[PDB]
Amino acid sequence: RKNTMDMYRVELNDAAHSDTPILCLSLSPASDPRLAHTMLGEILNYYTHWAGSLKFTFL
Amino acid sequence: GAQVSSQKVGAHENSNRAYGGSTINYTTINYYRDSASNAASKQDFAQDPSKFTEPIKDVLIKTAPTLN
Amino acid sequence: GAQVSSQKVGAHENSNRAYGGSTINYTTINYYRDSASNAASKQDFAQDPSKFTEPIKDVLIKTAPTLN
Amino acid sequence: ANNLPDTQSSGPAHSKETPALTAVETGATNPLVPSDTVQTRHVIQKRTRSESTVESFFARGACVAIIEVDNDSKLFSVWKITYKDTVQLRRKLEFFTYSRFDMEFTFVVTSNYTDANNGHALNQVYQIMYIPPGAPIPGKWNDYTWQTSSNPSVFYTYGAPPARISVPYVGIANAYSHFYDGFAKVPLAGQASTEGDSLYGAASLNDFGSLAVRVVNDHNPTKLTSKIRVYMKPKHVRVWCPRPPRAVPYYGPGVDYKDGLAPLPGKGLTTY
Amino acid sequence: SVRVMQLTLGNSTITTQEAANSVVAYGRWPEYIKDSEANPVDQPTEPDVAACRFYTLDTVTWRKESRGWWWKLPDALKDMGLFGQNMFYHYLGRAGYTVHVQCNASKFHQGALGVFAVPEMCLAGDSTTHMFTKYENANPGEKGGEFKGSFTLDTNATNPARNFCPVDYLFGSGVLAGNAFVYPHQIINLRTNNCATLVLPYVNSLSIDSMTKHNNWGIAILPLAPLDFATESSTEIPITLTIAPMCCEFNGLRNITVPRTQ
Amino acid sequence: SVRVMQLTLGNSTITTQEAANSVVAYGRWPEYIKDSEANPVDQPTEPDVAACRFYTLDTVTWRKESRGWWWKLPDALKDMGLFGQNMFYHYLGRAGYTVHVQCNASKFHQGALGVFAVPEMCLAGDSTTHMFTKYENANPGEKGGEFKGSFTLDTNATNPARNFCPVDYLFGSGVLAGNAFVYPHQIINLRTNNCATLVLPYVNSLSIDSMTKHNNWGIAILPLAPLDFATESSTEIPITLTIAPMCCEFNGLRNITVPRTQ
Amino acid sequence: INDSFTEGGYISMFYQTRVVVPLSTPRKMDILGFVSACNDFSVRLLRDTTHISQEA
Ligand SMILES: COc1ccc(OCc2ccc(COc3c(Cl)cccc3Cl)cc2)c(Cl)c1
């Protein structure tokens, strides 16, 4: 999926309830591969320090 | 023709000069006729991101339902 | 934006200028916007060593018995 | 940075007030002055503590590094920014636990022909680029990183007065820590010993980044070496929590010791 | 008087009839984070009476041959009731302390103990590898550690101890012990007092930090004048350490931390 | 609207787009003990955000054959973060709750769940010996228990189970289930709502009690109209239970309680 | 940069109940994630990015 339109799609299903994670991420907005290339991550890579709150929206 | 602005003191010396007086001001004078020759003042303003963050026609409240 | 302070004259010349006037003052003007660019004013204050010399809860007089 | 109090004349005493007696167990120091234990005269005090202020104590440019470049990968060098590569400034800073100040950096650049009778070169220009932790580090003396579109660079022409720049208080904490009794990681129960292990007393692996230095001129087959001596002066100083000074030789970035553990000489108890 | 006191925190009270006053480090009493100095934005937890109370750590014994002892805070209290629970459940934590050292003897005993509270008390290691002491050794908990009379380099390359080697006269850090008096302290001279009491505010270059990664204060106890009695070459008197955290506030609640041990 | 809500407690938020209002039991919102109703004289601990937050207990699955489920409070939350810690470290404890039951399906599913909050929910046992259910069985924790379709007497005299035998139509206590509507409740009818939300104040004949010896509330979930889907005799939909303690205050701190188990 | 001293924590997602669909409906579907900074966000110390290079 990486480097295709599928890297943006996280699939769910109607399976019975499970306690295992659907996805996992580390809060390293400038370095985590999944965050480093977003508009936010791109800007953070032109600076050495960051501070503040973030928000994740899921559709 | 001197412009006197004040600095935003970061690290403070154990002086009262570090907290007040002309000691926390800086002076500027333009020597050239063309504005292009000028340095950048750096006393730059900000604005509302709304034109990008919420370019919506019918304004909506976050507490209120977006899809109404 | 000039700051005019007075010097603490050590060795005095056989002049009245060595004892008064602008001749015992020095002038300063900041040229940079960032306070980091500034020189040190060196008009620095002192404080009470008590926080180190006597960090005692119940204050005691030297004339009076320390162990009471 | 001010005046000292005058000595007031003091006569004889015969009283129940005994300032000479005390009890140091309390953790306090007895604030006696001469007139407490002897007869004194009136002296108008004119001495001041102007030169022992925290500012005046540090108001000197101290050498923190000697970066070397051989213009014949040595065509460029990288120095990890620190104050612990030298001992003199380090020992003075360590009289305190925390500090907060601005910095002034002055660069003294020297160069010379290695050969007494060979080679020749035109005047050299140096580029001192600051690489903040995260920015790409140069792989060659002439790769794309030297474009410095965002990194601050200083171009020095050989023979010109020493270059000098000021840096603000850049710490990510409210003060610089001269001592950090901790780790950057906490090993968790269950993980391999290789896991969660970090250096004692170390914070970030890359605290302040580093300096990349190179000669901009095209290198000639001539054998030349240059050295950039970095001098740093803390200005606009504030310090917290005093500590006893280093008594034995430094042994690394930590408080580790190994060699000169017996600093004091012998002296007779009853010998003046 | 300077000699009789009573300290009450939560459900615990300490009484003493032979004190030598009390020291409040740097003249600062512990306090909570002010809004103007606040950093983490989430609502803090303040256990109050459940965590801010007197906890008695293990008693050590002083002999003619003792070199000294040391502890690290909050480390020594990590397993103490609800204080330890809050410490491990939160990413960030802050606290001040009231350290009460106890040591009674008799009018025919001698000896003086120097009790020092050191901010950022970094100790020296045992190897040629710098900053090699491992987490498990640096954080002994309530049992703390001991000072040594000399430096002994660990040479086992196959299995390095990765421990501290704090030499007493070098204050365990390469500085002369006689200068350790620049740190908040008290002296328990057997002919004068029973204890030493120190109130420590939170000291750090940040308003709040990780209590598991970082120890703010260090408590060092050194025999300034060795223990001696009547004619008994054999003499042992216990030294009990009672500490109470103050103004505890934690931020960043999640699942509990279980650090690796031994 | 009556259907969309958001509940925020501590660091946890719950959103719903298909609610049917919320019930506040007996019209009383949870509160702390007033000085005029106070009993233990010691300073209480109030964990606040560390304990008063949403904890998600284990998810159960609803099938055509399910008879019902039950839980006891504070029992079901005894192992939940810092709430459980405070519960076990203190002799006395008091708390109210926000119970949020979750169950979504589709527009082609049917079924109705009756969610009841019962004060002093005493259940019937399995033997001829009265009040024989043992502590370990009466307090299952977060996993709770289940209702049965019939009473089955335990006859093993050598090894009595000493457990409950809650028959569903008898509400597990000898009363008719249809009358259980006199207790604060909500109904999760699949064609109408996703959840049921109940705010429970502290109910007891005392201002504060032992949380380990006594369960104040009981949560009973019974299928009023069985689960059915399209034509799949096979249908399973999960029921998740999220509860948040409110206005927690504990008194009588000592060493931690470690109850006997299984 | 990835540094333990300034580590930020973990983000994860789980099923609370389960995704339920009726008959004649797709049993698998996608969700898309978005990230943005809040109004109290700031950055400092301009540096060069590693996201662009130039060979020769
Ligand atoms: C407690 O004592 C301290 C704390 C921090 C220190 O270093 C912090 C530091 C951070 C960035 C730079 C970068 O400075 C430079 C720039 Cl922008 C451009 C060109 C050259 C330099 Cl040189 C230099 C020093 C030192 Cl040396 C001692």
Coordinates of N, CA, C and O and ligand atoms in Angstrom, one line a residue, chain D residues 64 79 81-84 89 93 97-101 103-107 128-133 151-154 164-171 175-178 207-211 230-234, chain G residues 45-46, ligand 1:
Chain D
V64 N 36.2 26.9 23.6 CA 35.4 25.7 23.8 C 35.7 24.6 22.7 O 35.3 23.4 22.9
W79 N 31.6 19.6 14.1 CA 31.9 19.7 15.5 C 30.5 19.7 16.3 O 29.7 20.6 16.1
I81 N 28.3 20.6 19.0 CA 28.3 21.7 20.0 C 28.3 21.2 21.4 O 27.4 20.5 21.9
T82 N 29.3 21.7 22.2 CA 29.4 21.4 23.6 C 30.3 22.4 24.3 O 31.1 23.1 23.7
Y83 N 30.3 22.4 25.7 CA 31.2 23.2 26.5 C 32.1 22.3 27.3 O 33.0 22.8 28.0
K84 N 31.9 21.0 27.1 CA 32.7 20.0 27.8 C 34.0 19.5 27.2 O 34.7 18.7 27.7
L89 N 36.2 26.8 31.1 CA 34.8 27.3 31.1 C 33.9 26.3 31.8 O 33.1 26.7 32.7
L93 N 31.2 27.1 35.0 CA 29.8 26.9 34.8 C 29.2 26.0 35.9 O 28.1 26.2 36.4
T97 N 24.0 24.7 39.3 CA 23.3 23.6 38.7 C 22.5 24.0 37.5 O 22.4 23.2 36.5
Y98 N 22.0 25.2 37.4 CA 21.2 25.6 36.3 C 21.7 27.0 35.9 O 22.2 27.8 36.7
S99 N 21.5 27.3 34.6 CA 21.9 28.6 34.1 C 21.0 29.1 33.0 O 20.3 28.3 32.4
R100 N 21.0 30.4 32.7 CA 20.1 30.9 31.6 C 20.9 32.2 31.2 O 21.2 33.0 32.0
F101 N 21.2 32.2 29.9 CA 22.0 33.3 29.3 C 22.0 33.3 27.8 O 21.4 32.4 27.2
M103 N 24.5 33.9 24.3 CA 25.9 33.5 24.0 C 26.5 34.3 22.9 O 25.8 34.6 21.9
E104 N 27.7 34.7 23.0 CA 28.4 35.4 22.0 C 29.6 34.5 21.6 O 30.3 34.0 22.4
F105 N 29.6 34.2 20.3 CA 30.6 33.3 19.7 C 31.6 34.1 18.8 O 31.2 34.8 17.9
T106 N 32.9 34.0 19.1 CA 33.9 34.7 18.3 C 34.8 33.6 17.8 O 35.2 32.6 18.4
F107 N 35.1 33.7 16.5 CA 35.9 32.7 15.8 C 37.3 33.2 15.3 O 37.3 34.1 14.5
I128 N 31.0 28.6 8.0 CA 30.7 27.9 9.2 C 29.2 27.8 9.2 O 28.5 28.8 9.4
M129 N 28.7 26.6 9.0 CA 27.2 26.4 9.0 C 26.7 25.7 10.2 O 27.4 24.7 10.7
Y130 N 25.7 26.2 10.8 CA 25.1 25.6 12.0 C 24.0 24.6 11.5 O 23.1 25.0 10.7
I131 N 24.1 23.4 12.0 CA 23.2 22.3 11.6 C 22.4 22.0 12.8 O 22.8 21.2 13.7
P132 N 21.2 22.6 12.9 CA 20.3 22.3 14.1 C 19.9 20.8 14.1 O 19.7 20.2 13.0
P133 N 19.7 20.2 15.2 CA 19.4 18.8 15.3 C 18.1 18.4 14.4 O 17.0 18.9 14.7
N151 N 19.5 27.1 7.3 CA 20.5 27.1 8.3 C 21.3 28.3 8.3 O 21.6 28.9 7.3
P152 N 21.7 28.8 9.5 CA 22.5 30.1 9.6 C 23.9 29.8 9.3 O 24.5 28.8 9.8
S153 N 24.5 30.5 8.4 CA 25.9 30.3 8.0 C 26.7 31.6 8.2 O 26.1 32.7 8.2
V154 N 28.0 31.4 8.4 CA 28.9 32.6 8.6 C 30.0 32.4 7.6 O 30.7 31.3 7.5
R164 N 32.1 37.1 14.6 CA 31.4 37.0 15.8 C 29.8 37.1 15.7 O 29.4 38.0 14.9
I165 N 29.1 36.2 16.3 CA 27.7 36.2 16.3 C 27.1 36.0 17.7 O 27.8 35.5 18.6
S166 N 25.8 36.4 17.9 CA 25.1 36.2 19.1 C 24.0 35.2 19.0 O 23.4 35.1 17.9
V167 N 23.8 34.4 20.0 CA 22.7 33.3 20.0 C 21.9 33.6 21.3 O 22.4 33.9 22.3
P168 N 20.5 33.5 21.1 CA 19.6 33.7 22.3 C 19.6 32.5 23.2 O 20.4 31.6 23.0
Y169 N 18.8 32.6 24.2 CA 18.6 31.4 25.1 C 17.8 30.4 24.3 O 16.6 30.6 24.1
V170 N 18.5 29.3 23.9 CA 17.9 28.3 23.1 C 17.4 27.0 23.7 O 17.1 26.0 23.0
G171 N 17.4 26.9 25.1 CA 17.0 25.7 25.7 C 15.5 25.4 25.6 O 14.7 26.2 25.4
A175 N 15.7 26.6 31.8 CA 17.1 26.9 32.1 C 17.9 25.8 31.7 O 17.4 24.7 31.4
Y176 N 19.2 26.0 31.4 CA 20.1 25.0 31.0 C 20.5 24.2 32.3 O 20.7 24.7 33.3
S177 N 20.5 22.8 32.2 CA 20.9 22.0 33.3 C 22.4 21.6 33.2 O 22.8 21.0 32.2
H178 N 23.2 21.9 34.2 CA 24.6 21.6 34.1 C 24.7 20.1 34.7 O 25.7 19.4 34.4
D207 N 21.6 17.4 21.6 CA 21.1 18.6 22.4 C 21.0 19.9 21.5 O 19.9 20.4 21.3
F208 N 22.2 20.3 21.0 CA 22.2 21.6 20.3 C 22.7 21.5 18.8 O 22.9 22.5 18.2
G209 N 22.8 20.3 18.3 CA 23.3 20.2 16.9 C 24.8 20.3 16.8 O 25.5 20.1 17.8
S210 N 25.2 20.7 15.6 CA 26.7 20.9 15.4 C 27.0 21.9 14.4 O 26.2 22.4 13.7
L211 N 28.3 22.2 14.2 CA 28.9 23.1 13.3 C 29.6 22.3 12.2 O 30.4 21.4 12.5
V230 N 37.0 28.3 18.5 CA 35.7 28.8 18.9 C 35.8 29.4 20.4 O 36.1 28.6 21.3
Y231 N 35.4 30.6 20.5 CA 35.4 31.3 21.8 C 33.9 31.6 22.1 O 33.2 32.2 21.3
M232 N 33.5 31.3 23.3 CA 32.1 31.6 23.7 C 32.1 32.4 25.1 O 32.9 32.1 26.0
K233 N 31.2 33.4 25.1 CA 31.0 34.2 26.3 C 29.5 34.3 26.7 O 28.7 34.7 25.8
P234 N 29.2 33.9 27.9 CA 27.8 34.0 28.3 C 27.5 35.4 28.7 O 28.3 36.0 29.5
Chain G
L45 N 13.2 27.9 15.8 CA 14.6 27.5 15.3 C 14.5 27.0 13.9 O 14.5 25.7 13.7
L46 N 14.5 27.9 12.9 CA 14.4 27.5 11.5 C 15.6 26.7 11.1 O 16.8 27.1 11.4
Ligands
LIG1 C1 25.1 25.6 29.8 O1 26.1 26.0 28.8 C2 25.8 25.9 27.5 C3 24.6 25.8 26.9 C4 24.4 25.7 25.5 C5 25.5 25.8 24.6 O2 25.3 25.7 23.3 C6 24.0 26.0 22.8 C7 24.1 26.4 21.4 C8 23.0 26.2 20.5 C9 23.1 26.6 19.2 C10 24.3 27.2 18.7 C11 24.4 27.6 17.3 O3 25.1 28.9 17.3 C12 25.7 29.3 16.1 C13 24.8 29.7 15.0 CL1 23.1 29.9 15.3 C14 25.3 30.1 13.8 C15 26.7 30.1 13.6 C16 27.6 29.6 14.6 C17 27.1 29.2 15.8 CL2 28.2 28.7 17.1 C18 25.4 27.4 19.6 C19 25.3 27.0 20.9 C20 26.8 26.0 25.2 CL3 28.3 26.1 24.2 C21 27.0 26.0 26.6

